[PDB]
Amino acid sequence: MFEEINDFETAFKRLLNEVLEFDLQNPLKDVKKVLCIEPHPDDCVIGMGGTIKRLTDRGIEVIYICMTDGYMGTTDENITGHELAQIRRKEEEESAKMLGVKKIYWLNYRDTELPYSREVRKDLVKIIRKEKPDGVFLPDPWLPYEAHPDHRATGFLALDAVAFSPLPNFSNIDLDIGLKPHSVSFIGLYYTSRPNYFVDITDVMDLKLKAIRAHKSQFPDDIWETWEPFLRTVALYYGQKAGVKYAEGFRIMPGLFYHITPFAELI
Amino acid sequence: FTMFEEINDFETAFKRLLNEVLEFDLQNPLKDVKKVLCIEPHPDDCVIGMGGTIKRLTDRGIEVIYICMTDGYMGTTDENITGHELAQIRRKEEEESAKMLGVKKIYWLNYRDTELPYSREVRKDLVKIIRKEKPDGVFLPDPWLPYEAHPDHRATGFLALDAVAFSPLPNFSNIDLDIGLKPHSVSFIGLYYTSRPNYFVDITDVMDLKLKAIRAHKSQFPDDIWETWEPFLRTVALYYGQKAGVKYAEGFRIMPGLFYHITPFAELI
Amino acid sequence: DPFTMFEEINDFETAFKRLLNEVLEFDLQNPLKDVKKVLCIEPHPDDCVIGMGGTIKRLTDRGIEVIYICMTDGYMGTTDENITGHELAQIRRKEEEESAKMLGVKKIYWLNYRDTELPYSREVRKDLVKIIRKEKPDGVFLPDPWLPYEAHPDHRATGFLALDAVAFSPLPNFSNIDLDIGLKPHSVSFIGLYYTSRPNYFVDITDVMDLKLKAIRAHKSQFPDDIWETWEPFLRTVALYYGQKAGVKYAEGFRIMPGLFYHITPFAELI
Amino acid sequence: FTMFEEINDFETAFKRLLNEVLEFDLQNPLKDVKKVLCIEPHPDDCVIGMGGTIKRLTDRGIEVIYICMTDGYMGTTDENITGHELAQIRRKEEEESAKMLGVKKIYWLNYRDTELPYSREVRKDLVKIIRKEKPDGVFLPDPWLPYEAHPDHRATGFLALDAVAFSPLPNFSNIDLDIGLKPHSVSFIGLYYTSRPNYFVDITDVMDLKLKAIRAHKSQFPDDIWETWEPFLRTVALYYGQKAGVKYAEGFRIMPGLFYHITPFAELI
Amino acid sequence: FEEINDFETAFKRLLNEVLEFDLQNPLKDVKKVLCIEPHPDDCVIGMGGTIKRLTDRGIEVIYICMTDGYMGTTDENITGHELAQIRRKEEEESAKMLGVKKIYWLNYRDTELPYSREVRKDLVKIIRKEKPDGVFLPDPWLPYEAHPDHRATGFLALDAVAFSPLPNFSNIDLDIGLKPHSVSFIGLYYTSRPNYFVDITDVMDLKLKAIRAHKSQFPDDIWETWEPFLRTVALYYGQKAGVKYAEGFRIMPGLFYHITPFAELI
Amino acid sequence: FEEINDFETAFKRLLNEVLEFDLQNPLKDVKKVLCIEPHPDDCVIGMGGTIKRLTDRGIEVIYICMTDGYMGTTDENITGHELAQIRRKEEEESAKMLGVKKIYWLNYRDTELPYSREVRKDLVKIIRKEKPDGVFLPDPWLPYEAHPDHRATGFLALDAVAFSPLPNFSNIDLDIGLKPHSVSFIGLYYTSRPNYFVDITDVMDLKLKAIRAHKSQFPDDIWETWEPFLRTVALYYGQKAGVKYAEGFRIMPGLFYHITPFAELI
Ligand SMILES: CC(=O)N[C@@H]1[C@@H](O)[C@H](O[C@@H]2O[C@H](CO)[C@@H](O)[C@H](O)[C@H]2NC(C)=O)[C@@H](CO)O[C@H]1O
Ligand SMILES: CC(=O)N[C@@H]1[C@@H](O)[C@H](O[C@@H]2O[C@H](CO)[C@@H](O)[C@H](O)[C@H]2NC(C)=O)[C@@H](CO)O[C@H]1O
Ligand SMILES: CC(=O)N[C@@H]1[C@@H](O)[C@H](O[C@@H]2O[C@H](CO)[C@@H](O)[C@H](O)[C@H]2NC(C)=O)[C@@H](CO)O[C@H]1O
Ligand SMILES: CC(=O)N[C@@H]1[C@@H](O)[C@H](O[C@@H]2O[C@H](CO)[C@@H](O)[C@H](O)[C@H]2NC(C)=O)[C@@H](CO)O[C@H]1O
Ligand SMILES: CC(=O)N[C@@H]1[C@@H](O)[C@H](O[C@@H]2O[C@H](CO)[C@@H](O)[C@H](O)[C@H]2NC(C)=O)[C@@H](CO)O[C@H]1O
Ligand SMILES: CC(=O)N[C@@H]1[C@@H](O)[C@H](O[C@@H]2O[C@H](CO)[C@@H](O)[C@H](O)[C@H]2NC(C)=O)[C@@H](CO)O[C@H]1O
Ligand SMILES: [Zn+2]
Ligand SMILES: [Zn+2]
Ligand SMILES: [Zn+2]
Ligand SMILES: [Zn+2]
Ligand SMILES: [Zn+2]
Ligand SMILES: [Zn+2]
């Protein structure tokens, strides 16, 4: 019912606490397996590398999905995109090990050329339906001034895949060959400007930064002079709001708030 | 009139632009509207979004036509219902919901749920209807609604605005003209499902009919589901209500046509 | 980048100020310092003059080369049932050539994608990069694709495509045939967003306003007297909005940020 | 109509299928046709392809409507003519060519020369017209013409056949119905520009008018060009002529609608 | 590695010795086949007789239906959504009459079947799961075939067969269990250039009854024209096979579907 | 001279006098040609012999490779990214053996070559720069060609040739220096309807060695079947040219690629 209620603030608090059982305090309660979905090789480590270490240690299985092949990411006129792909595959495998990640799916869409297509949704759902994960981390597609199409696409496609994985009529051949529908229990947005849940990474920062530099191709010493200070400044932004030094921010909301929720911004 | 060049305050020029130049009436914005389109992504989006307001407009004697972008093919967790069945069902569910609110005509584009293109082709389909029904008003979902993760919603919002904007251009889908349909300018644009509403409608009296017209969509709202949705729908009506100083309201964003293009102060309404 | 350790910082506000001033050398005060050549990228014929026509005059006068890229052909922009889109294109080409001269713009590239039908495709990125790589410009102006309530697809597309083209122009693996036929990669030094609701850098145009408005009306097809009764007051009201924030009468606003902030920068909004 | 199962020769069943079951009339195939569409990829394709036949049909009192798929934007080597100019020009050139042959109405889709999609959207546009003009006949270029390297031609051929086939299905572009246009079945399909024609038309009397109506397209045929095209166009008319036992003829391939689907003996006509 | 100097010699040696191409008994070691149909009814109309004979000889036959049949009615009262639901049941009944147990439905909309990468990926996924020995698909080179769903299905089928064995193609299929697969046999049905026939004179009455199972597609109005047609087709194929009623197929070695200028000579 | 009443007369006069079509020595004034190949190896397999002979007679030959060869291995250990890198080196070595110095790589992915406007624009850009006299491309009408990248390359090549001289097509090409260009000669390789041949009996062993340069595509397993095939192809072409081993091409006037119902008669 809820007919008896006359205040919005009352109905809001009752909707989150009683109806949805939304737990912002310990939101990872029953999570044994998560997917981290990264646009490019290095996006998971840069975005939430610290948190992935902490989850790996607490004994939680972490699987990467890498949307693109990193083909474009060099100014060096001597490295063909084909070489760079081969390289950045090895660089992610090394970064992965340092953080405790064992499995990585490679979609192999070309860097800069990631469709916001039905086909890519179907690919992501196939994996979600197989690995039956409890949680999914994906980049916030509403991050202001994000000018990289592969990031915007990955964010939207991830949410669509999460939302449609439980619908048996969606990519129905997945069912006809064994894969049953699946509902993810937890959705975390990384790389967000409106985080509502933080993770202290002050202890783990040095490992995070070493696991980033594992991506040698992306971070020679030239480049690293600018990126190290940046990455620290990011951790401090998140830290300020979490009252620690170095933190990683995430936006966590109930699945319901990703649809026709005009008060979604109030968490 | 007197010279606009003479103005030195923005606040002055702004108030003069809205009141004198545009004649923008936030007070009674539906003044001369005899016919409106409500554009819904899925079967149930009109009734959930602005079902109350549709009843009130139907009663005040205003013709209300639905355009449904998709067929609802995907919207069941029941492994026994093919998308083809569910479409057939949700067509009947919208026809029943429609009658309860006083809506007589519904156009079905029949784009598949989850597979609504943001294509030129879909704009052409919407314009064709607008040009035929010559409506005074169009309601459509705010495509800028924060955290809206459903592509069919984002698409419908953008496509609707594009269709409104391009319906009056004779060079757009010119075959429409060559077969009878003359260009048309809509007089009124309302965004429903918005987090930035500037105009409200008391629905406290009509809430029980609205909720009954939602449950008409049996396939979407068994009792399991309805335990969570009823409280939600009420919480939404209260959010809108708070800002309108009533209990249960429906919010809309209404702006002048001009503000949907290169208007850096559009947010200030 | 002096004596001090970046690890030793415990305040965000400190690290932020040090990132912008020392690491990035971000100059919001005089951001155009060493710019001899800019591209202005416009969705339709008239978008450059309406958006930043004043600023283009001032840059032309200070001796800076300004090149237009026009994404579309303006084919759709008339209610007159007698003008075919093919006529209107031909017309608006001449109207932009006249507007261009009044502002000191000599070169204009026409992509000739049809008005209302501008793809957000790879192909269009390749076209923009080709030009950037040829003209090796120091600066690019493009419309803010995050402008609230912008309902025109050609505007949203142009904004995104422009940023992508800027970002990918320096990657030799992107449209590699461009290289194989002479065009070397290029890094733009400056990015300005026009038509933005979050400007951080202004330009007094109070002196230039009357020329700007005359250069807009050069687009006769788009601004008969009927229409102009509503647009003149609007355009002035816009200049005042920007003016208020710049403490002058009539200004043009731009959003200028470091290249890095267009990617995974959660504090990008704080500028 | 008497006892099909007891046939044991193919040749018998074939002759009975064409004569009795389909009533296929290769002799006088235009019997009851009062209105036809000629579908041309570019401005000039109808006059070059079947200009003579169009004159003869116009004279015998039959209404002939052009559909032009593209705008001709690309068709000049002159570095001074923008595609926008050339479109405007070739529109006037087709209007003058049209009058010389007795054609009053022309639909312009305005897809750009070289950029004609083989999309669903273009089928929907063609069906809209077919459903309005309710024509008895449609002429379109044979998409199986060997070594045809122009995509706009291949596309137009396929799209035309699809539009003919789908015009009578009420579930196809259903909004067409919801706004007045009822389904329509075309009675006659003619392929022009074909290497396997089965029906000819003497144009020996009309040739000089045809050639004058081609040159109406000044932009496409200066004197330089015309030195090579006039002899070509005559050589084509002779190829068709040889098979029709006249001097100058126009060839068409006419088959029953059914043979455009899963007909392994389609080639035997 | 012979320096042979006649083409006719090298040709006969290529087919018989190098490729072991058996036009005589080409189904030798086939325990499982896919029949790929554009629309519900295309398998039964095309090769319904042959499917019965393969079912009886104990061979597993699986249907893949590309489209939903949404468009296939002139009746202004039947929504495409109804017609889909109906034609699903009609194919299930037709299927049983011929001994077909499993049917995959891609549910691409009738008239709207993309020739996209995405559709290739869908077909490969199935091929890689069912590991079939054989695939039947409609000849995309059939002259005057004006139905896009048919042309598309033909091309997509061949592409799927060709790419199913490449581990780099739709690599996620592998990462979740499905290993690459090489089909051993490719049959084109609905072809004007058949090189292998099947007597269906005994089975014809069942075939025709299994077609009429598709009530929506064949009321009595329509059936007056289709029955004679379907018989005339069987006779065309029959004439070349020296029986009354036959079904024709084009069977070639995998290799001949690529850069083979003498492919036509079989 | 309108007053002709035989077709055969007008036809012979059209080819000889009006068009000056020279099937006898069609390469007369050609100093530079493009060979357009779908995959790395398609030029050497298709017309490798002819490329050697043109290189020797002092004619510049440039390759355009549409795809990256990413898919072309059954080996589950080679990522497509590795295979691309490899086949680049394999084509560079094959190229040198035949006298080819320059190669353009479009880097569209194997199996994923769009028949898009964008790809036409890419090909025209090159044609307009290199101003070649001749272009060789695979016959898109080759019967039973089931590889989409081949069909696409054929069509795209013809479109690029046809549109390179139109200043309104990809107009930015002009605005940055590249003037329009008309190719003088079009040769279709990999065709079943050739009208012009080239003896390669002398060059065969080099051709075959230049093919095997593509190690990734031709281990010894594979080569057992391909060597006999490649010889059988050369013999097919040879038979019609009255030599042992030949390469066939279809050469027609530019005009015959449009609305020419007698195009087949050459
Ligand atoms: C798009 C833009 O202007 N921002 C730049 C980023 O694109 C860029 O990120 C890197 O871009 C490459 C090009 O596509 C990618 O291959 C690479 O994966 C990606 N790296 C990350 C961090 O995801 C960064 C750093 O090069 O600079 C921005 O300015
Ligand atoms: C996108 C997301 O994660 N949010 C969920 C919504 O997608 C979902 O909305 C319903 O989605 C179906 C799938 O396409 C539609 O058929 C149906 O019309 C739609 N309902 C509405 C209100 O339009 C809702 C309901 O399950 O839950 C969200 O969390
Ligand atoms: C309502 C909406 O979505 N936007 C309208 C605009 O379309 C329109 O702007 C003009 O649109 C034409 C059609 O695409 C363009 O050709 C024309 O250049 C464009 N003008 C500018 C400034 O770029 C305006 C003006 O009528 O109204 C908007 O509301
Ligand atoms: C495909 C090819 O290379 N053949 C040429 C034709 O494509 C070409 O056709 C002409 O193409 C122009 C640009 O697409 C069109 O504007 C023009 O209408 C069209 N001609 C006709 C009569 O349809 C012809 C003519 O230049 O030459 C062929 O060689
Ligand atoms: C293009 C044309 O004129 N040929 C017609 C066929 O397209 C048509 O095929 C039928 O099309 C329906 C709509 O796409 C399908 O639902 C239906 O399954 C299909 N029939 C078969 C046997 O597959 C046929 C039959 O109406 O008539 C041709 O003339
Ligand atoms: C389509 C089909 O069934 N025929 C096969 C050909 O497709 C195949 O060609 C090869 O395909 C690979 C995958 O795309 C390519 O990487 C490779 O370049 C290509 N070979 C050539 C000659 O270019 C051939 C050989 O693998 O076998 C046919 O059976
Ligand atoms: Zn990234
Ligand atoms: Zn919805
Ligand atoms: Zn504009
Ligand atoms: Zn043409
Ligand atoms: Zn069919
Ligand atoms: Zn190849």
Residue numbers in the entry:
A (entry chain A): 1 to 267
B (entry chain B), D (entry chain F): -1 to 267
C (entry chain C): -3 to 267
E (entry chain E), F (entry chain D): 2 to 267
Sentences from the paper on this structure:
Deacetylase from the extremophile Pyrococcus chitonophagus has been analyzed by X-ray crystallography, small-angle X-ray scattering, differential scanning calorimetry, isothermal titration calorimetry and NMR to determine its structure, thermodynamics and enzymatic properties. It is a hexameric, zinc-containing metalloenzyme that retains its structural integrity up to temperatures slightly exceeding 100 °C. It removes the acetyl group specifically from the non-reducing end of the sugar substrate. Pch-Dac crystallizes as ‘a dimer of trimers’, with two doughnut-shaped trimers stacked back-to-back along a molecular three-fold axis, with a 8–10 Å channel through the middle of this assembly.
Three crystal forms were analyzed, including monoclinic crystals of the protein-substrate complex (Pch-Dac-lig), having two protein hexamers in the crystal’s asymmetric unit and trigonal crystals of the unliganded protein (Pch-Dac), having half a hexamer in the asymmetric unit, with the other half being related by the crystallographic two-fold axis. A (GlcNAc)2 substrate molecule was found in each substrate-binding cavity of the 12 crystallographically independent subunits in the Pch-Dac-lig structure. The electron density clearly indicated two connected sugar rings. The GlcNAc moiety that is closer to the active site is held in place by a network of hydrogen bonds to the surrounding protein residues. The N-acetyl group is directed toward Zn2+ and its carbonyl oxygen atom completes the tetrahedral coordination sphere of the Zn2+ ion (the Zn2+ to O distance is 2.1 ± 0.03 Å). The substrate’s N-acetyl group is flanked by Asp42 and His259* (* denotes that the residue comes from the neighboring subunit). Its position is equidistant from the two flanking residues (3.5 ± 0.2 Å from the carbonyl oxygen to Nε2 of His259 and to Oδ1 of Asp42). The methyl part of the N-acetyl group of the substrate is lodged in a hydrophobic pocket formed by Ile46, Phe219, Trp227 and Ile260*. The substrate approaches the Zn2+ ion in a monodentate manner, displacing the water molecule with the oxygen atom of its acetyl group. There is no evidence in the electron density of a water molecule that could act as the hydrolytic water and there is no place where a water molecule could be fitted in the immediate vicinity of the active site.
